[PDB]
Amino acid sequence: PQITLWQRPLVTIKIGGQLKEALLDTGADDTVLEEMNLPGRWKPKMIGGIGGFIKVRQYDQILIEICGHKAIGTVLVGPTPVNIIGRNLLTQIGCTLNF
Amino acid sequence: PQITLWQRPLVTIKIGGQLKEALLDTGADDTVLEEMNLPGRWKPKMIGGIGGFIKVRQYDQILIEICGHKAIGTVLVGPTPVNIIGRNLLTQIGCTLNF
Ligand SMILES: COC(=O)N[C@H](C(=O)Nc1ccccc1CC[C@@H]1CN[C@H](COC(=O)NCc2ccccc2)CO1)C(c1ccccc1)c1ccccc1
Ligand SMILES: [Cl-]
Ligand SMILES: [Cl-]
Ligand SMILES: [Cl-]
């Protein structure tokens, strides 16, 4: 699809068999989701946002569907104002910016 | 142009006669630039994101040339870690997400 930016680019994602709403964020290098359960082991990661740095849990090779496109990659879990799909997964779904 | 997401979507902007580098951020509702002087009246605002909030100055009706395209709108100025072009100006240049 072609998504305009008059409103927030919120889409449905599917992870762990559940639907969630998430923001397509070209300013984010990584994908960060609000508190949830994911399988396997996690590693520590510090991420910097507009307000400062936060600790998150890094899970690798996680299956996630974004706006109907399947991806398998790194998902960070932590305190975020909204679920964000960052460039690591936007590249997997073939997303570009155009003007 | 078609801007890839393999790297951060950084472009050249021109504002107040100054050339700067800025991030095209579909996850940002607003445009926020690192500390600089702008003409006219301003009012304070708090903007939130990962890590919390930052206090910024809000200037309205500001002219910005983004990657050669003129856009007018509100520009926030404060302690952001990177210059961000948010949706309020991305819409003006006809920027869309495509996949
Ligand atoms: C009242 O309205 C808001 O509070 N709006 C928020 C917003 O637009 N706020 C905002 C406005 C102007 C400039 C910068 C920012 C802050 C948001 C931008 C988003 N992209 C980059 C995200 O990049 C980072 O956080 N840095 C690195 C990183 C790496 C991996 C994963 C995430 C982030 C930089 O921050 C918004 C939002 C909040 C609640 C519900 C829906 C949306 C939001 C918050 C946090 C993340 C994404 C969006
Ligand atoms: Cl990844
Ligand atoms: Cl505006
Ligand atoms: Cl349009």
From TrEMBL, chains A, B:
Residues 20-89 form the Peptidase A2 domain. GO terms for biological process: proteolysis. It is found in: Host endosome, Host multivesicular body; Virion membrane. Its main location: host cell. GO terms for molecular function: aspartic-type endopeptidase activity. SUPFAM superfamilies: Acid proteases. One of its GO terms (cellular component) is virion membrane. This is Protease. It comes from Human immunodeficiency virus type 1. The gene is pol.
